[PDB]
Nucleic acid binder design. Structure first.
Ligand SMILES: [Mg+2]
Ligand SMILES: [Mg+2]
Ligand SMILES: [Mg+2]
Ligand SMILES: [Mg+2]
Ligand SMILES: [Mg+2]
Ligand SMILES: [Mg+2]
Ligand SMILES: [Mg+2]
Ligand SMILES: [Mg+2]
Ligand SMILES: [Mg+2]
Ligand SMILES: [Mg+2]
Ligand SMILES: [Mg+2]
Ligand SMILES: [Mg+2]
Lengths: 144, 66, 185, 141, 57, 75, 142, 62, 57, 100
RNA sequence: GUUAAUUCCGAUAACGAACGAGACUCUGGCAUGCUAACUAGUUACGCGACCCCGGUCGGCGUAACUUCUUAGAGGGACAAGUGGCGUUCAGCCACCCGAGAUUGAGCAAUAACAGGUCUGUGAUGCCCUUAGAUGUCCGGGGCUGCACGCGCGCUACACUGACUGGCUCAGCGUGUGCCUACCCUACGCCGGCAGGCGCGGGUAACCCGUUGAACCCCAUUCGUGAUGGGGAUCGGGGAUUGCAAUUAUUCCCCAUGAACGAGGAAUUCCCAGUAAGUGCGGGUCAUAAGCUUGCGUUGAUUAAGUCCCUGCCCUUUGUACACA
């Protein structure tokens, strides 16, 4: 049960982002933005999958089942305290925002703050530390 | 590092020069001899005086001490 | 009842120390024979009471360095137990005997010291010290950032040192200390 | 005839976990697969049937000393929280898994709420743990 | 006592009482040759002994 | 600079290589098998407990940090 | 008949362990459990030096129950190692011939001295201006 | 050249600029009537033996 | 200053004491702060008998 | 009848004089008494910077205040223990009586 | 000569004295001998529970005792004893006996620095400004601002490891406040966590508490890849203290995943329960430790030496130095 099978996908292609199927599944799903180790683990535990296999060893109906679960979390009993875009400002819906939508919604919140001329938006527009740290002695080489 | 100071050596010579007829050869006897015979305020320098008395009386039974 | 066996499995008899220089500054024979390489301590009071410590305990002490694992003696007892076990099944004799051979081949015979530098021989106790230390740092530098675990690196470093193969880290540094000694003689 | 402390505990707890699984009355919650077992853990529990293992472990502690509560269970299952660049401290476990596992062990009659507060192990649970301790000692002999 | 103060705080409380008393008396009686005080607390009453030189003053 | 390229499941050459020579080593650990067959340590542990269950290599001592195996006797 | 009970303590760094030995059969157990499952299990030969150096011949008529409190794991394991030994030593000098205790004290001492007499060592006080006992904080020049 | 080992018969004092090598004088174990004063690095007792790699040179007395 | 200090000196070790010292620090004999030091008799300085042989103020 | 008096002081010698005084008072008035129990010395620890300003090598005082606490229990009527503890207390010792 | 020592033997135009060192005080260590304990326990006994006469129980209650625990008086070690070295003095080395044959601290002189503190004070001299507060109070901001340079530190650079289970051990202490209105919290419900809601104990050897602490130990998964190392930065959501958190107070949940592959010249600390790793208390505190003060826990390498560097002490000698 240890031989490499045929149809072992060394790379997968899930949400326009690569999946290295040499790694184990719960840490190989992690390679796309929007999912970490814990959300990966809970999503492919809701998808009843043996974790001893690796991400290139399982089949395409299973990968489409997994991508439907992580794209549609609440319709598979994923908790509402789990998602990263809980109660969002534009449409008021609990979603997990993933790879290509993630940085675009980051850009939306960022330019929204810069647009309403917030203190934190101005600090992002100036390229500084926005969570209130000191900048007297730490974090120099990024800013020349 | 065990050097007896002037307050041990002087007082021990005093106890010996006035009480040679009761002092002896062993520490554990002339210790309580010294404790009955002087008001020595602590066990530590009490024992140090009594030990110096034992060393001086081995010297005296060897020969005369200056 | 006699016949105390190191880890209950390795006899402290059948251990021949060929060289008469390190007789008393080694400790493997019957008065120094213990069960575990863990002792209560009290070896660092006087000057040479270090040398009455069993060398298995001394190796277990000296494997405990570089920060992350200062004061993990029980872990080092585990490392020494696995190290002796795979020394036995990899070479085929008493691991205490291969340890004594590793010390007697790895301890430098003369060192260099600024009295430029003059070349002076070592005391046998510093020979034991620096032998054990070179073996431990050979194991550590072999195992760092590596799949090959350190109870394997200690094991094959000991058997390479007892062969004197000059593939052992300790034997390499011992021969280079001696060649710079005979150059700075 | 042996007891619990007469045998090794690390396979005692896995034997008792297998016991409660093959019983199958233990009333698991349904947030089991989604819960992180403490605030100081970093991932999910790796073993998927961990609730039976924890039930075994807390029943063993209840056998060893009674009068433990949800707070005594969070203290006995606390551990290090590595706070990042801030130093690691000690932290308690999760309250709700300790609470639900004590409610499960009194749902099926193994523990009971003794006055002075907290649970203590009922004689049915005590005879259960000592029967499986005889089981484990025989399987190791 | 209805609040029942702890004795770890009671000893530092009467210490701080004796300290404030000592300073207030040594500044009232700097002319008058103050030397010290000794409190003592009987049941229901406290006799407190001011101890000075010019007791007529 | 250098990168170890360990493969994570058996191809046929490494698999029958392991089935022939690995039950004839003196010291069989996952760290030895990983550097002799260029495989992962996890794959090495799984393959070696497979060979143990098949009954070819011999457990010598078991531990959390290290597992160590030998070959069988000659007699 | 007569209760031949001797209760002897033994000390390490802070862990005190007091053993209670009666006449019975060779029952050695610590804190309600026997010797062979007391963590750390790598250090079981420290628990086993009295029984292995003396055999179960000396322990045949004695049962020993050890209660342990204090310190950390191997301090406790060293206190049990001391206290079982001092327990059978005191039991022998109270209830059997003193030359047998001479035998047993000599056999244990010329193996190791830390198994009958205690270590007087304890963790000494941190002084101010240092992170520990005698190390100091780092000097800051120019 | 032969490797000869010799027994320390007495320890004279410590030499060296940092005070780091004890200057002893040894007896050769095969020619017990020949004694040579040499500098020895490390912790030295009386009545232990040293593996002389070079048995001809001699340190001068401090 | 010095007559007051020496009067206190002679008065207290005629009233009976193994020694004393009186230190008057401050500005005197100009504007730069000096300190006058008046010592005689036995005067222990170190150890535990400083707590019960030395009356200080 | 089962009463408990408690003796607490910073200073130990006057305290154990007062405690031995009350014990020998119960002895001469010939009623049973369990001995003085010594419940532990509570140490009050303050560590402050020695300098009022900030500079200096960072030195630290170590002020201690030890508190000794003893108990005496008696099987006696209240009038007897009032008659005893009314007299002979040194003012460093604080005495308190709990009847039941 | 000798000592850690202006410590002593001893020499002697000096004799007799004082301070400092020592002595001392606290702490560490040793007491099966004393004093005693329902606010500490042990052992027995009787019930009770469990397992096949015995074993376990911090399950229940009490007949003895104080070994463990508490803490008082005492005691104990003095270079006492032995063998060498030395004026055979002062003393040094080794060893037996032994809990110890240098535990650690506190106090600590004469003379001084223009060291620091007027921002500790109702300790304070002198000077300031003569409603349009440098008094005081309130509202907001700042003390946090960031092209850069430095110091004290925490986390790391992983396999001697990380993660996930499981197992099993401490000691310092602190806890409901004069004003002062804010305490330590067991136990039971709800919630994934942060927490929320109820009733309780505690002014404390009583309750938190047998302080079920970490590292450690055992068993899983990982596999030399900036990787399951690292957790900076950053979006969103929920809680707690507060009159109020924006410049995110703090905590939690998810996601995001930077440098960092053991550090150039240079340099800090340390030698036995010591360095180091590891957590827990106190102070700060409404909220609260990357600090600091204490505490235990795991616990070594090396060294018993020297004046070479950096400095210190004493003697002699040289000086054109004396704010040296
Ligand atoms: Mg490794
Ligand atoms: Mg834990
Ligand atoms: Mg003095
Ligand atoms: Mg002194
Ligand atoms: Mg100035
Ligand atoms: Mg003006
Ligand atoms: Mg500031
Ligand atoms: Mg990580
Ligand atoms: Mg990563
Ligand atoms: Mg320096
Ligand atoms: Mg601060
Ligand atoms: Mg000249």
């Amino acid at each position: 049960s240890l031989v490499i099978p045929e149809k072992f996908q060394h790379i997968l292609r899930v949400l326009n982002t690569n999946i290295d199927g040499r790694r184990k599944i719960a840490f190989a799903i992690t390679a796309i933005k929007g999912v970490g180790r814990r959300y990966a683990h809970v999503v492919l535990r809701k998808a009843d999958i043996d974790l001893t296999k690796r991400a290139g060893e399982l089949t395409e109906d299973e990968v489409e089942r997994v991508i439907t679960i992580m794209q549609n979390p609440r319709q598979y009993k994923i908790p509402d305290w789990f998602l990263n875009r809980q109660k969002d400002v534009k449409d008021g819906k609990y979603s997990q925002v993933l790879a290509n939508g993630l940085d675009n919604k980051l850009r939306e919140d960022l330019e929204r703050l810069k647009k309403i001329r917030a203190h934190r938006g101005l600090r992002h527009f100036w390229g500084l530390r926005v969570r209130g740290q000191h900048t007297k002695t730490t974090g120099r080489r990024g800013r020349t | 590092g065990r050097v007896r100071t002037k307050t041990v050596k002087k007082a021990a010579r005093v106890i010996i020069e006035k009480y040679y007829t009761r002092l002896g050869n062993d520490f554990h006897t002339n210790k309580r001899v010294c404790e009955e015979i002087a008001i020595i305020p602590s066990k530590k320098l009490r024992n140090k005086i009594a030990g110096y008395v034992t060393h001086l009386m081995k010297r005296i039974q060897r020969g005369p001490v200056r | 009842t006699p016949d105390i066996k190191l880890f209950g499995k390795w006899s402290t008899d059948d251990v021949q120390i060929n060289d008469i220089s390190l007789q008393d500054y080694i400790a493997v024979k019957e008065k120094y024979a213990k069960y575990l390489p863990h002792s209560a301590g009290r070896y660092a009071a006087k000057r040479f009471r270090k040398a009455q410590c069993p060398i298995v305990e001394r190796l277990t002490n000296s494997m405990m360095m570089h920060g992350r694992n200062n004061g993990k003696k029980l872990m080092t007892v585990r490392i020494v137990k696995h190290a002796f076990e795979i020394i036995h099944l990899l070479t085929g004799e008493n691991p205490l005997q291969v340890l004594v051979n590793a010390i007697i081949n790895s301890g430098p015979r003369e060192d260099s010291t600024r009295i430029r530098r003059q070349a002076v021989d070592v005391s046998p106790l510093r020979r034991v010290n620096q032998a054990i230390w070179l073996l431990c740092t050979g194991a550590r530098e072999a195992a760092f950032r590596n799949i090959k675990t350190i109870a394997e690196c200690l094991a094959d470093e000991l058997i390479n040192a007892a062969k004197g193969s000059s593939n052992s880290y300790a034997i390499k540094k011992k021969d280079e200390l001696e060649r710079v000694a005979k150059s700075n003689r | 005839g042996v007891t619990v402390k007469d045998v090794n505990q690390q396979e005692f707890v896995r034997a008792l976990a297998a016991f409660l699984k093959k019983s199958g009355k233990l009333k698991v919650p349904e947030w089991v697969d989604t819960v992180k077992l403490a605030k100081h853990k970093e991932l999910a529990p790796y073993d998927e049937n961990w609730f039976y293992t924890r039930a075994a472990s807390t029943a063993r502690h209840l056998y060893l000393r009674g009068g433990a509560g949800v707070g005594s269970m969070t203290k006995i299952y606390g551990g290090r929280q590595r706070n990042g660049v801030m130093p690691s401290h000690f932290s308690r476990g999760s309250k709700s898994v300790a609470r639900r596992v004590l409610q499960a062990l009194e749902g099926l009659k193994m523990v009971e709420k003794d006055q002075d507060g907290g649970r203590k192990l009922t004689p049915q649970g005590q005879r259960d743990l000592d029967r499986i301790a005889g089981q484990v000692a025989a399987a190791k002999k | 006592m209805a609040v029942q103060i702890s004795k770890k705080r009671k000893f530092v409380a009467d210490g701080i009482f004796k300290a404030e008393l000592n300073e207030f008396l040594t500044r009232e009686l700097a002319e008058d040759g103050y030397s010290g005080v000794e409190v003592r607390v009987t049941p229901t009453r406290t006799e407190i002994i001011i101890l000075a030189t010019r007791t007529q003053n | 600079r250098d990168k170890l390229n360990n493969l994570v499941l058996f191809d046929k050459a490494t698999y029958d290589k392991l089935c022939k020579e690995v039950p004839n080593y003196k010291l069989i650990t996952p760290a030895v098998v990983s550097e002799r067959l260029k495989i992962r340590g996890s794959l090495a542990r799984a393959a070696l407990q497979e060979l143990l269950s098949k009954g070819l290599i011999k457990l010598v001592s078991k531990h959390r940090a290290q597992v160590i195996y030998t070959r069988n006797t000659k007699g | 008949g007569p209760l031949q009970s001797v209760q002897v303590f033994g000390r390490k760094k802070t862990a005190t362990a007091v053993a209670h030995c009666k006449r019975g059969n060779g029952l050695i157990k610590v804190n309600g459990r026997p010797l062979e499952m007391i963590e750390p299990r790598t250090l079981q030969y420290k628990l086993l030096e009295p029984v292995l150096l003396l055999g179960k011949e000396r322990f045949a008529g004695v049962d020993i129950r050890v209660r342990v409190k204090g310190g950390g794991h191997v301090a406790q394991i060293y206190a049990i190692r001391q206290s079982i030994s001092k327990a059978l030593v005191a039991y022998y000098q109270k209830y059997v011939d003193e030359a047998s205790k001479k035998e047993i004290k000599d056999i244990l001492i010329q193996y190791d001295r830390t198994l009958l007499v205690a270590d007087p060592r304890r963790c000494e006080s941190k002084k101010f201006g240092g992170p520990g006992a005698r190390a100091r904080y780092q000097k800051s020049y120019r | 050249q032969p490797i000869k080992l010799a027994r320390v018969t007495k320890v004279l004092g410590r030499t060296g600029s940092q005070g780091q090598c004890t200057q002893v004088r040894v007896e050769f174990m095969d020619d017990t009537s020949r004694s040579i004063i040499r500098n020895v690095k490390g912790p030295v007792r009386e009545g232990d033996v040293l593996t002389l790699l070079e048995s001809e040179r001699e340190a001068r007395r401090l | 200053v010095r007559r007051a200090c020496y009067g206190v000196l002679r008065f207290i070790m005629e009233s009976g004491a193994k020694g004393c010292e009186v230190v008057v620090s401050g500005k005197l004999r100009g504007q730069r702060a000096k300190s006058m030091k008046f010592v005689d008799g036995l005067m222990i300085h170190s150890g535990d008998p400083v707590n019960y042989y030395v009356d200080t103020a | 009848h089962r009463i408990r008096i408690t003796l607490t002081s910073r200073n130990v010698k006057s305290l154990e004089k007062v405690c031995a005084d009350l014990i020998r008072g119960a002895k001469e008035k010939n009623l049973k008494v369990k001995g003085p129990v010594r419940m532990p010395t509570k140490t009050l620890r303050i560590t402050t910077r020695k300098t009022p300003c900030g500079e200096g090598s960072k030195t630290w005082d170590r002020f201690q205040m030890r508190i000794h606490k003893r108990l005496i229990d008696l099987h006696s009527p209240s009038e007897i223990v009032k008659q005893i503890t009314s007299i002979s207390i040194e003012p460093g010792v604080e005495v308190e009586v709990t009847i039941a």
